[PDB]
Amino acid sequence: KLEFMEMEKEFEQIDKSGSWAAIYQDIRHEASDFPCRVAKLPKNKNRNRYRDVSPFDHSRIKLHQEDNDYINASLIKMEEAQRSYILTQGPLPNTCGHFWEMVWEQKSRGVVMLNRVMEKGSLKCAQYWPQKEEKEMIFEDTNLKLTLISEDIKSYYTVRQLELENLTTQETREILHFHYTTWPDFGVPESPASFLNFLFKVRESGSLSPEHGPVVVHCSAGIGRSGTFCLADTCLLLMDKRKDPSSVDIKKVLLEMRKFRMGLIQTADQLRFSYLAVIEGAKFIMGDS
């Protein structure tokens, strides 16, 4: 069906009128506003990487510990697409244990990292996983042990096989770590192809499967790149699920996502990239393999 000629015609239109920003800002100013009282509690101050980026109280992930159940993480649940994601910030030196605790408690199978531990001079993210097989990490506060089993390093991303062990229950689970290493803060991936190839890799690993807990997606703040990634995936699902792919309104989908976590997708160009990714990705999937 030459239906994909409309989407591209529309995309080229927006591109022609250069109205990406207008569209993006319109979305920002219609975005939901929900309370984040827990995130702002004084005792949770050192658990937030950024002052103004917090999870809404209603969709926040709660740690199953009694002392403090707080972690800057939100559950994004997309009904029609039938997929959930947990979006969180790059773990801080004092929240790495909380991060794996969440991964464990939520029964996540995969972790999607879209930033780097070193981005333009600043840490922006703690080294929350082991870089050497022989140097496993133990998080004494959450009583978890993490070991690197192997890693497949590619040009634009790295996939690591990790073993996460709950020292209390003595159980172990294999966690897949999908790390896209070439996506700058407030930037876009190297290309629609590298991004899509990364996304497909995550998908085929079954990490996004309903049989597992939600995938944990993070970047530095957990909204810009994580938002772009999730939006693209979700819209790709809706294009493959609806008889009329062109009926998928990415703007409306972004708004829906912003009801679960603030600031999803940080720049007009990330929104444009989302469209490109979705349109091209939809062509590859609907296309003949």
Ligand SMILES: Cc1ccc2cc(-c3ccc(C[C@@](Cc4ccc(C(F)(F)P(=O)(O)O)cc4)(c4ccccc4)n4nnc5ccccc54)cc3)cc(P(=O)(O)O)c2n1
């Ligand atoms: C209803 C509501 C409520 C709160 C909101 C907050 C922000 C909202 C608020 C702040 C910021 C920028 C950020 C965090 C941030 C970092 C990296 C990314 C990234 F894109 F690179 P990523 O890929 O890692 O995600 C995304 C966000 C910041 C920016 C640059 C450097 C350091 C810190 N920051 N955070 N606190 C700050 C205090 C002073 C100065 C800057 C601050 C963005 C969105 C935006 C919105 P809005 O879009 O709806 O208007 C909000 N809306």
Ligand SMILES: [Cl-]
């Ligand atoms: Cl850090």
Ligand SMILES: [Mg+2]
């Ligand atoms: Mg309007």
